[model samples]
Each structure stands twice: as C-alpha cells, then as structure tokens.
Target chain A: MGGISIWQLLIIAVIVVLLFGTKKLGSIGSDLGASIKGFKKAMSDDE
Target chain B: MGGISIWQLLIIAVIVVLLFGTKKLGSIGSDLGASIKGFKKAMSDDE
Candidate 1:
C-alpha cells in the first residue's frame, strides 16, 4: 500500500505552514476553536 | 524522492478547497469542519 514518507509529510508540513504562516495560523486556530465550540454546542443541542 | 506523486495534489485540494470553500461555505461551523480538518491536527501536535 502507498503511504507518506517523512519528507512527503515534511513537504506537506512546510507547504501548509508556508501557506498559513505562524501568525495567520494562530488566527485560524482561534477562529476555528471558537468555530468548533459553537459547532459542537449546536450539534450537541440537536443530538 | 518519495514514490508518491500525489505528493502535491492533496495539498492543492486543501489549499483550494479550504480557501475557496471559505468564500461561500464559511462562517463558523463549515469553516471549522473544513479548515480545522486540515490544521487542527497541525496545532494539537504540530511538533
């Protein structure tokens, strides 16, 4: 079966990191954490 | 080099799908489910 090698993963890491950058990465995190929190709240309320 | 050729593809998918999808599918829930699916893992144990 095909799988990711270390550099393959590293490349993914660098590419994503480079794309997001640590600054905006943090931004995305806060927004996402806030986002997921409400999301779970909604889903939990529903189910 | 790693034998994986899709090495670059899924990243594009993530970049485009997440980036573009956010234009319409964004807000809170969809943004988290979409963006978080890619980066939450990066944050939790990014090291």
Candidate 2:
C-alpha cells in the first residue's frame, strides 16, 4: 500500500548476486577490506 | 559486448541510493567497518 515491498528488494538482491556471483563477490570483499585498511593507515599517518 | 552495460549498472546504483540515502549508506559503511575490525581482532586473537 506504500513504499517498495520486501519482495522487490529480494529480487534486486538476487539479480545483483546473479550478476556478481559468490566468488567474484568474495574478491570484491577482500579488495574493499584492503582499501579500508589502506585508508585507515593513511589517516593514522596524517596524525 | 556481452553482459550488463555501464549505464545499466549506473541505473542500479541510482536505484539503490534512492532506496537507501547517503546517511543510511554512511551508517552501513561504518557498520561494515566495525564488522571487519571485529573479524580482524578475532583472527589476531586466534594467532
């Protein structure tokens, strides 16, 4: 009756996973972790 | 030449951002960072 339904969100999630798959998603996760770690290191270095 | 185009990806990104605005996304980023930090702490403790 109002906003987007949970079912619509689930479909979007499924589409994204289908596009990226699990293994590619894992590499992206690690890459994101590394980027965050590097960002933290840079921030600490600036202090 | 095959799968999803950059425009399609951009549209998806727009949809996601619309669903969850910058503020919500910022909190989600911090939550993800905290989870990763906790995971790293656990890994170090295991060593």
Candidate 3:
C-alpha cells in the first residue's frame, strides 16, 4: 500500500494535484502540492 | 502496455531509479547500499 514504486506514486501525485488545487481545496492541496514540489525538486536535483 | 511512449518509459525508469534503484539491474553490486541506507534512515526519521 504505502510501498508503491516512485513512478506510481508520482502519477497519483499528479492526478491529485490536477483534481485539487491549493486554497479552495485546503490541506489536501497543500500537502499534495508540497509532495509534488518535492518530487520535482528531487528529480531535477538528480539531474 | 505497448502504448507507452519513450518519454513515459523514461519517466517511469527515472522514478524507479529514484526509488528502488539498480538493484534490479545487471549485477546487484551498485551503490544500492547507499540508497537503501539513506531510505531507511529517512523512513525512521521522517517525523
């Protein structure tokens, strides 16, 4: 369940971001946004 | 399955590397030790 490979996790992260944005969507948006931002940062940092 | 584009495959591959790493590739003697060590430490200290 929580052990998803990072690829699957990233897809879920993208879908959540698309489905809910910050402000109007509250905590979910913020948390998901943070994760997405971190994911992107990590990915870019790896390069 | 076969419908995945090269870009999609690359994304998935990068995610896998960011997660599981080359433990599933060639010989199992890459710097996987470093990655797992870091992952476990992070998991434990995620709080």
Candidate 4:
C-alpha cells in the first residue's frame, strides 16, 4: 500500500531533530518513547 | 510488574503539551503519530 516511506521518515527524523533541536527532540524522544511503550502496554492490557 | 499506567500517560501527555505547547505537540503529534503509523507499516513490509 502507498504510505509514508522509509526514506521520507529518515528525512523527517533528521529534519525534526534539526528543527526541534537536540534538547527539544530529547524531551519528546524520551517522553514520547515512554508514551509508546505505555501505549503498547495499554494494548496488552486491553487485549 | 505493572507498566507505565494510564494516569502516568495522562500526566505525560499534559506535561508534554505544556512543555511543547499546543502547536508544538500538534506538530509532534501529527508528525510522530504518522511516524508511528509508518513505523508499524515498515515492520509489515519488513516481515
């Protein structure tokens, strides 16, 4: 299926890192990272 | 052990919203949300 591609994600990640800056990315990286883990855990609980 | 809970995510989301601001979270939410969606898709393609 047509969807967001890996190349686009590579570009997007790099751009977001630069645009958001390291610390800002760090803030979100860890926060959102944790969020994702929890998101999965929530799914497991739901399942 | 129980993992990161719903309450914690609520706190994290709220804090991230405040820290990053609505517009900023909007940026990450959409971008990162799409990233996550793609992330799963990439795995599907990989498999």
DockQ for every prediction shown: 0.09, 0.04, 0.03, 0.05
Of candidate 4 chain B, the 10-residue stretch with the lowest lDDT total is B38-47
Better of 1 and 3 by DockQ: 1
Q: RMSD per prediction, one decimal?
A: 9.9, 14.2, 15.3, 14.2
Error of 4 at B2 (Å): 41
- Write model 2 residue lDDT over A1-47, tens digit each, in one string: 43465444544764564454334434555556556655654444222
Off by over 4 Å in 3: A1-3, A24-47, B1-47
How high is the lDDT of residue B18 in model 2?
A: 48
Which residue segments of model 4 deviate by more than 4 Å? A1-4, A45-47, B1-23, B26-47
Clash count list over all predictions: 0, 0, 0, 0
The better-scoring model by TM-score among 1 and 2 is 1
lDDT of each: 0.52, 0.51, 0.43, 0.52
lDDT (Cα, tens digit) per residue for candidate 3, span B1-47: 44645686477556544343333322222233334444344334326
Model 4, C-alpha of B43: deviation from truth (Å): 22
Tens-digit lDDT string for candidate 3 (A1-47): 64555546666653443343322234433344445444554444232
| Interface RMSD, per-candidate values to 1 decimal | 10.3, 11.1, 15.7, 11.3
Q: After superposition, which runs of candidate 2 have C-alpha atoms over 4 Å from their true positions?
A: A1-11, A14-47, B1-3, B30-47
CAPRI quality of model 4: incorrect
Q: What CAPRI-style quality would you assign to candidate 3?
A: incorrect
Ranking by TM-score: 4, 1, 2, 3
